[PDB]
UniProtKB/Swiss-Prot annotation:
Name this protein carries in UniProt: Synaptojanin-2-binding protein
Lineage, highest ranks first: Eukaryota, Metazoa, Chordata, Craniata, Vertebrata
Subcellular location: Mitochondrion outer membrane
Any GO BP: regulation of Notch signaling pathway
Role this protein plays: Regulates endocytosis of activin type 2 receptor kinases through the Ral/RALBP1-dependent pathway and may be involved in suppression of activin-induced signal transduction.
Record's keyword terms, sorted: Membrane, Mitochondrion, Mitochondrion outer membrane, Transmembrane, Transmembrane helix
Domain PDZ: 20-107
Broad class of where this protein is predominantly found: mitochondrion
Segments on the Cytoplasmic face: 8-114
Assembly description: Binds (via the PDZ domain) to isoform 2A of SYNJ2 (via the unique motif in the C-terminus). Interacts (via C-terminus) with RALBP1. Interacts (via PDZ domain) with ACVR2A (via C-terminus) and ACVR2B (via C-terminus). Forms a ternary complex with ACVR2A and RALBP1. Interacts with MAPK12. Interacts with DLL1; enhances DLL1 protein stability, and promotes notch signaling in endothelial cells.
GO CC, any one term: mitochondrial outer membrane
Length: 120
């Protein structure tokens, strides 16, 4: 049994870390927009929930922790999958004073040397 990638040619090396962002519910809910939903799948290869934009004077801003481009894996221990855009928004509300959002930080690693002095 053989197997191959069969994908686009290019380097995709990035370190992913799992972190839990615990924010407080504002006067209404939160201060940041999200993108998700099997129908609104921010991407064709992704259907989870991500962050499109974050308020300047919102909880997501003050806390600092939460940052745009984050993929909220689960909320308060509730995996976010096979759900619609409305399904994700709702859960965010049910959360309550304490909203736990487990996001994954994935940044492209600088794969390559650097022009400088003798590297120790």
């Amino acid at each position: 049994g053989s197997s191959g990638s069969s994908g686009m040619n290019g380097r995709v090396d990035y370190l992913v870390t799992e972190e839990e962002i615990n924010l407080t519910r504002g006067p209404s809910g939160l201060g940041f927009n999200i993108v998700g939903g099997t129908d609104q799948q921010y991407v064709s290869n992704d259907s989870g929930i991500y962050v499109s934009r974050i308020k300047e004077n919102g909880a997501a801003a003050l806390d600092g922790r939460l940052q745009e481009g984050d993929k909220i894996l689960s909320v308060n221990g509730q995996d976010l999958k096979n759900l619609l855009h409305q399904d994700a928004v709702d859960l965010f509300r049910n959360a309550g004073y304490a909203v736990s959002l487990r996001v994954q930080h994935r940044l492209q690693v600088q794969n390559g040397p650097i022009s400088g002095p003798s590297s120790g």
